[PDB]
A paper describes a structure:
Aldehyde-alcohol dehydrogenase (AdhE) is a bifunctional aldehyde-alcohol dehydrogenase highly conserved in bacteria as well as fungus, algae, and protozoan parasites. The N-terminal aldehyde dehydrogenase (ALDH) domain converts acetyl-CoA to acetaldehyde, which is then converted to ethanol by the C-terminal alcohol dehydrogenase (ADH) domain. Structurally, AdhE is interesting as this 96 kDa protein oligomerises to form long filaments which can be visualised by electron microscopy.
160,830 particles out of 251,604 particles picked were further processed using cisTEM 14 to generate a 3.5 Å resolution cryo-EM map. Most of the side chains were resolved in the cryo-EM map, and we built atomic models of six complete AdhE molecules and two ADH domains. These molecules are stacked upon each other to form a right-handed helix with a 70 Å helical pitch and 150 Å diameter. The cryo-EM structure of AdhE shows that the ALDH and ADH domains in the AdhE monomer are separated by a linker (residues 441–448). Together with a β-hairpin protruding from the ALDH domain, the linker makes a three-stranded β-sheet stabilizing connections between the two catalytic domains. Two AdhE monomers form a dimer in a head-to-head arm-crossing fashion. Subsequently, two dimers (four AdhE molecules) form one helical pitch via the interaction of ADH domains in a tail-to-tail manner. F670 in the ADH domain is inserted into a hydrophobic pocket formed by F462, I460, and I712 of the other ADH domain and holds the ADH-ADH domains together. To further investigate the implication of the spirosome structure of AdhE, the plausible active sites of ALDH and ADH were highlighted on the helical structure. Compared with WT, a dramatic decrease in the AdhE activity was observed for the mutants defective in spirosome formation, implying that the spirosome formation that we observed in the cryo-EM structure is important for AdhE activity.
Numbering used by the authors:
A (entry chain D): 644 to 693
B (entry chain C): 396 to 869
C (entry chain B): 1 to 445
D (entry chain D): 446 to 495
Write the structure that this text describes.
Amino acid sequence: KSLCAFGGLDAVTHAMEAYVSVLASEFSDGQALQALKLLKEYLPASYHEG
Amino acid sequence: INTPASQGGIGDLYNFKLAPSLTLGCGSWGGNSISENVGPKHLINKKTVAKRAENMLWHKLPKSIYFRRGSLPIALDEVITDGHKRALIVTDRFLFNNGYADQITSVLKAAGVETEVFFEVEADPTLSIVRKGAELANSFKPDVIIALGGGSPMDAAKIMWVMYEHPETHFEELALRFMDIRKRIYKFPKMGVKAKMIAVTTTSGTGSEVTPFAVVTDDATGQKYPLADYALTPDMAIVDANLVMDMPKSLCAFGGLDAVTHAMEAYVSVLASEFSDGQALQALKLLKEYLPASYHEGSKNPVARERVHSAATIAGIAFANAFLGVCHSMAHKLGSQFHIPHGLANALLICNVIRYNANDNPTKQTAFSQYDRPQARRRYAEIADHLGLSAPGDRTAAKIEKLLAWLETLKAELGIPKSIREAGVQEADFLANVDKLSEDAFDDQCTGANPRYPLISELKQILLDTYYGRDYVE
Amino acid sequence: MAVTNVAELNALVERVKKAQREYASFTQEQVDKIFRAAALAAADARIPLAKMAVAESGMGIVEDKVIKNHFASEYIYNAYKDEKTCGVLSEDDTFGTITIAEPIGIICGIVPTTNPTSTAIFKSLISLKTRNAIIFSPHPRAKDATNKAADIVLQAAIAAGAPKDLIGWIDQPSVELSNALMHHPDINLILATGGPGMVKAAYSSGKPAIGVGAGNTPVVIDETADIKRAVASVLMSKTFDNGVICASEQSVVVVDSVYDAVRERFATHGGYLLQGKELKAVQDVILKNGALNAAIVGQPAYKIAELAGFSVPENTKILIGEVTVVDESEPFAHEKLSPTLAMYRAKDFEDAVEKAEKLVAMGGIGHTSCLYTDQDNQPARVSYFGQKMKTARILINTPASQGGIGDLYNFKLAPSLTLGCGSWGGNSISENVGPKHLINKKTVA
Amino acid sequence: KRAENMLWHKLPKSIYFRRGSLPIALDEVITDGHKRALIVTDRFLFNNGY
């Protein structure tokens, strides 16, 4: 830490942006939401211990 | 030959590549016993150890997927610009009698390439049509194979592409080596050397243009053969929606319920990774709005139809990496034996299978229950409250009941009968052939990723309770 | 044409001798077609042979017979597809030497009750791969299944270019026709498999003989292992086809400091402990003449429980006894061929290793042995356990059976059969049987 | 005239993933069929044992 925190926030922004852009089709909304789902549980636990 | 049976002449040795006359011993006395030379390998016993090794998972797809309304002629322009000169089209004869295959040939002959059509595909592949097609293929020698249709023309094209590339490999060793995935032992011959395959779909509700599956029926014995490995997936899939604007109800309802079951199963199987849960849920999300609107009117609403089409191929992406379950196999056999169209077979079966798998914990045929799988109850609950069918304070069994109460109302207005008997199946030949289909749907790859390991006496219970129009309950 | 007396026995032995002498002149490219046709038509009839075997023998489970029949066909086909067994094998052209190969002759084959239909495909296929002939001697209880399997393979092979017969079998066996056929002059190799009764009879006959047997396979659980997965693995592998697979688990040696918890881990699941009078009621039933009572083989747990003389829940799986003495006179130390088990208590790691060696020294043939421990923290215990044990396979955190999830558990393993030895006495490790045990090679110069 | 557009969904051909899958992934480049190789990395990863 905090090399892990930088990559975590990087992936947060990459998933937060690519859902609202004007080229967002329906093949790529689901995996953007899945990426946003998988971070809010497992990111602080990976930050504190590891 | 022309040599004494002794030692010591001149030169190197007579002979120099020979052991002494001793060191050769046998192990018996009686008859026709040849001796052999004794060395250190007769005095050593060798042992082997083996640790527990972990496994790996994957996510494999075609290289490029082009999709939307009106994208067929602008997709196959890039095969004109690079660089192909000869072509072959595999389709069904109903599509050739109407004006559908001409939409490819009229565009391809404008730049000028040799084209021809093989319109002889039955509703099932019959292992002898594919040999005549392969004969046509290596008589013509193309380098682009374009499959059109849905279901049978696609996997017919896959099988007749695998033997155009290797005309010496006989079919029986393909049937013996390659029957399931999860097994990487050993390897497949290298394909894609002198041709490549394009897949164009027509019907909305099968996802066979992204999956590495094929099923071939033999003529003589009536024996099925599955073939499955990731060297049969196409190189490019085209998902257009102008090809499906005129199909009648209820051909759309069958494909809709087919995609419903393909997405419902592949979320709860025991090979479900985290790369393929999201698209299974996206496919389940996109149908509950746009399917009844596409059923009642059409093509007066040219928006819901293309979204149902796209969500069908989303579920096709989903189940090609985490595999299917039990109602798939039972649906294949129940459809192939009674000549029911495939698609309403598993429409009749899914509710009993949901009641089957949702048992609390009978530890009678479980395996590694504390290792990877949470439960099959919890994932059905996750489907139910993702799809938006829950009060804010509930328990699990209420959510499951609200889930399977929903799709019965869906099956109501899509207009399908309530048991197998109303579909027109007599009692005599069904009670004659229930024990034929009971264990025959056990070995047919289920195995499989069902969360609960079945057995044969429990499948005929389902096949009886679906024919009488009851519900599986204990 | 039936076979009951010695005269028609000698008739069909002369017939198959004439046919084998006819067959041993084919080329390499026309043996392989016979091999593919035989393997395919043997793999098609999975279900009817399992139904016939369960109907005739009266014990076993149908689905397990289906899957092990399928696996035993496909492994033998895919392992030996393209192997030089006919004609010239190797040469040294600039020095004159050529190595050629030549067959043995006629093989006798002995088939037990427990795996009646899977061994016939194995022995038939590796016989007619290497240009030989085979005569089967089934067991009187289940005999129609074995003859049906050999018949399916035979007429599969006939319509590909084979001679008029190559395979023979005995109808209505007895105790004298087997000894008549084992001492017939012009047969050359016998293949016996099963229990310790007839492999010693096959050994002491003055002919070449290899025996496919099984020993009592122990499992060692130390204190630094996971407890739930070990019990799950043992209960999964032992109940497979009621435990009639060759060399399944037979004893569990548990170190003391994690002992009692493992007890209730068998109690809150399919296992059922027994610590009182009922041990005598089950020690009087497994061993009646000193020679393994044939009334408790392949049966479920509750049927041998009620035949012992008491009641039990219906959904139970395994009967667990616990003994302290380790000798030949104790009845649980034998191999049992039934869903039963015996467990022991040890002080520490080396005591458990010593007691496991003393268990494996009783079977006569070293086949497998199992250890359940952490493998990412104690490599020294792994090396020590691999050093001291003397069996063919040594398994770490793995059940001694087949069929889990993924590819295979394990995927680089042969079946539990195909491993045979050539002696009985002491410290004899078995090894896997293939076509190189059936071919004598010659050299010219 | 006014023509409409098309969308796509493009990825690598195969993605292998999970804990402990590096040496079993690059076994298939050994089995078929390559003979020469080149590795591009940073010097910090080369100074450590990676």
